[PDB]
């Protein structure tokens, strides 16, 4: 698609992140209103998830069961809520500072960009102790994405680059993006295509696996875009933070 679509969210303020499931539901962290909203597929009914105590929430990730994880950035914590429930669980991460992005794989491992500590932490599925990934030289990391092989990609926001670690590796790679400026979010698909909200340039870019020439996606009029999500059909959603809206492009 080369015509962007503005989704029928209403009342967003400075939205910070987006997640989608395979049922077409879209969740957004409506950061300026301390809330997480869900847009139901088809009906376009918007509902507010019954999280409690959020402040300036940033990242969001969802699993297929409809469990939602949010980085409660202003409270230095990560919380999750199962679908329709009124139980929220604080994950036993420790010592977070202004955390932003969050990612969750099919196994239920959770990764968080611990932005204010220049590190990426994880709670492996089945463990109650966090580990710190062996990235080096991060500055204010802003987003994280993971694939089914356990590769992890991070927007190293303060260094204008995207870094990746394969599972078991202690040495990161820098992806061949060009001219990024304070990138804010990242998403990956099962083919290895990587999408990045190039925040400081008001654009979204992608790299096919093996490509050395990023593609600027045909969004228009973005302002400080903040989060990106992609489903298995290659549709791309982006929180156009500065314009209080969510836009999408189908493949």
Token pair recorded at residue 225: 């875009």
CA–CA separation, 195 and 189 (whole Å): 9
Which residues are paired to 78 by β-bridges? Answer: 71
**Quick one: which H or E segment has residue 81?**
strand 77-81
Which one, of 166, 180, 184, lies nearest residue 58 by Cα?
A: 184
CA–CA separation, 143 and 157 (whole Å): 8
Q: For residue 137, give the CATH number of its domain.
A: 2.120.10.30
Experimental technique for the deposited model: X-ray
Residues 6+ apart with CB under 8 A from 96: 76, 77, 78, 112, 114, 116, 117, 121
* Domain region containing 203: 1-251
Residues 6+ apart with CB under 8 A from 248: 4, 5, 7, 235, 236, 237, 238
Which one, of 74, 68, 77, 75, lies nearest residue 50 by Cα?
A: 68
User: Domain total for the chain?
Assistant: 1
Token pair recorded at residue 160: 């204008």
The CA-to-CA distance between both ends of the chain, in Å, stands at 5
Token pair recorded at residue 121: 């932490």
């Amino acid at each position: 698609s080369n015509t962007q679509t503005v989704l029928p969210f209403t009342g967003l303020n400075t939205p910070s992140g987006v997640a989608v499931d395979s049922a077409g539901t879209v969740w957004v962290t409506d950061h300026g209103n301390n809330r997480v909203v869900k847009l139901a597929a088809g009906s376009n009914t918007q509902t507010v998830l019954p999280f409690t105590g959020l402040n300036t929430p940033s990242g969001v990730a969802v699993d297929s069961a409809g469990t939602v994880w949010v980085t409660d950035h202003g409270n230095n914590r990560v919380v999750k809520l199962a679908a329709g429930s009124n139980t929220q669980t604080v994950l036993p991460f420790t010592g977070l500072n202004t955390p932003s992005g969050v990612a969750v794989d099919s196994a239920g491992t959770v990764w968080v960009t611990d932005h204010g500590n220049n590190r990426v932490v994880k709670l492996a599925a089945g463990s109650n102790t966090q580990t710190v990934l062996p990235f080096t030289g991060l500055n204010t990391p802003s987003g994280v994405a993971v694939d089914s092989a356990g590769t992890v990609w991070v927007t190293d926001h303060g260094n204008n680059r995207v870094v990746k670690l394969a599972a078991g590796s202690n040495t990161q790679t820098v992806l061949p993006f060009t001219g990024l400026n304070t990138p804010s979010g990242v998403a990956v698909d099962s083919a290895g295509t990587v999408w990045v909200t190039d925040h400081g340039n008001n654009r979204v870019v992608k790299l096919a696996a093996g490509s050395n020439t990023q593609t600027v996606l045909p969004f228009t009029g973005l302002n400080t875009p903040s989060g990106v999500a992609v489903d298995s059909a290659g549709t791309v959603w982006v929180t156009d933070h500065g314009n209080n809206r969510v836009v999408k492009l189908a493949a």
